[PDB]
Amino acid sequence: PEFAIAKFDYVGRSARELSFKKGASLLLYHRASEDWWEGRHNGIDGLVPHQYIVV
């Protein structure tokens, strides 16, 4: 359960993706693959792209 900060805006195109703004704080639960994390933002659980966040 890692705290992450968004390095750039991400606009999800799927209900499986979270959308967030650069600078946002996100909670990352688990590293699903080298490119995806299961996380939560804005009270919603979903996938977070590794390329847009920093831990």
CSV table of C-alpha atoms in Angstrom, one decimal:
chain,number,residue,atom,x,y,z
A,1,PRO,CA,0.0,0.0,0.0
A,2,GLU,CA,2.2,2.8,-1.4
A,3,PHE,CA,1.5,6.5,-1.6
A,4,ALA,CA,2.0,7.8,-5.2
A,5,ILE,CA,1.9,11.2,-6.9
A,6,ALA,CA,0.8,11.6,-10.5
A,7,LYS,CA,3.6,12.9,-12.8
A,8,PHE,CA,1.1,13.8,-15.5
A,9,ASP,CA,-2.7,13.9,-16.2
A,10,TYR,CA,-4.2,10.6,-17.1
A,11,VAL,CA,-7.6,10.3,-18.6
A,12,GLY,CA,-9.0,6.8,-18.5
A,13,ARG,CA,-10.9,5.6,-21.5
A,14,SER,CA,-12.2,2.4,-19.8
A,15,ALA,CA,-14.2,1.8,-16.6
A,16,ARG,CA,-11.2,-0.4,-15.5
A,17,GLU,CA,-9.0,2.7,-15.5
A,18,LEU,CA,-8.7,5.5,-13.0
A,19,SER,CA,-8.5,9.1,-14.2
A,20,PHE,CA,-6.4,11.7,-12.3
A,21,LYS,CA,-4.6,15.0,-12.5
A,22,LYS,CA,-0.9,15.7,-12.3
A,23,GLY,CA,0.0,16.3,-8.7
A,24,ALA,CA,-2.8,14.0,-7.3
A,25,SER,CA,-2.1,11.7,-4.5
A,26,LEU,CA,-3.0,8.0,-5.2
A,27,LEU,CA,-3.0,5.0,-3.0
A,28,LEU,CA,-1.4,2.0,-4.8
A,29,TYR,CA,-2.4,-1.4,-3.5
A,30,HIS,CA,-0.5,-3.8,-5.7
A,31,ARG,CA,1.8,-4.0,-8.7
A,32,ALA,CA,-0.3,-5.9,-11.3
A,33,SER,CA,2.3,-5.9,-14.0
A,34,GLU,CA,5.4,-3.9,-14.9
A,35,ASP,CA,3.1,-1.3,-16.4
A,36,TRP,CA,0.0,-1.4,-14.2
A,37,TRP,CA,-1.0,-1.0,-10.6
A,38,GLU,CA,-4.2,-1.7,-8.7
A,39,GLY,CA,-4.9,1.6,-6.9
A,40,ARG,CA,-7.6,3.9,-5.6
A,41,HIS,CA,-8.2,7.6,-6.4
A,42,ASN,CA,-11.3,9.8,-5.9
A,43,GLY,CA,-12.8,6.9,-3.9
A,44,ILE,CA,-12.7,4.6,-6.9
A,45,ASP,CA,-10.7,1.4,-7.3
A,46,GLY,CA,-9.1,0.6,-10.6
A,47,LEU,CA,-5.9,0.4,-12.7
A,48,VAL,CA,-3.2,3.0,-12.6
A,49,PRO,CA,-0.6,3.2,-15.3
A,50,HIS,CA,3.0,3.0,-13.9
A,51,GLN,CA,4.2,5.5,-16.6
A,52,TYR,CA,2.1,8.3,-15.0
A,53,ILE,CA,2.9,8.0,-11.3
A,54,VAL,CA,5.9,8.0,-9.0
A,55,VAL,CA,6.4,6.1,-5.8
